[PDB]
Symmetry: C3
Subunit: 35 residues, 3 copies
């Protein structure tokens, strides 16, 4: 169970990094429209 959990947290950390990239890119695009 602890091993399954560690893999689940690993995959969720990878998901978070990809969503942080997606949100930073969106924030920059919105700043190009409006300061």
């Amino acid at each position: 169970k602890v091993s399954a959990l560690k893999e689940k947290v690993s995959a969720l950390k990878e998901q978070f990094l990809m969503l942080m990239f997606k949100v930073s890119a969106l924030k920059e695009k919105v700043s190009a429209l409006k300061e």
Copy 2:
């Protein structure tokens, strides 16, 4: 402790799915403003 942790990860995975939906919907709205 392992059980408490599994529930905490479960709830955080549900949180992530809802934030992915929110960010995809926002990305589409921003693309409607600017390609």
Copy 3:
């Protein structure tokens, strides 16, 4: 291992809260551009 995992989940929950704030602030900014 369980302790390391609990800290990893703690830090990821703090990361999520900060990304939820960032996305809510971006959503409001986009609504100021377009209803």
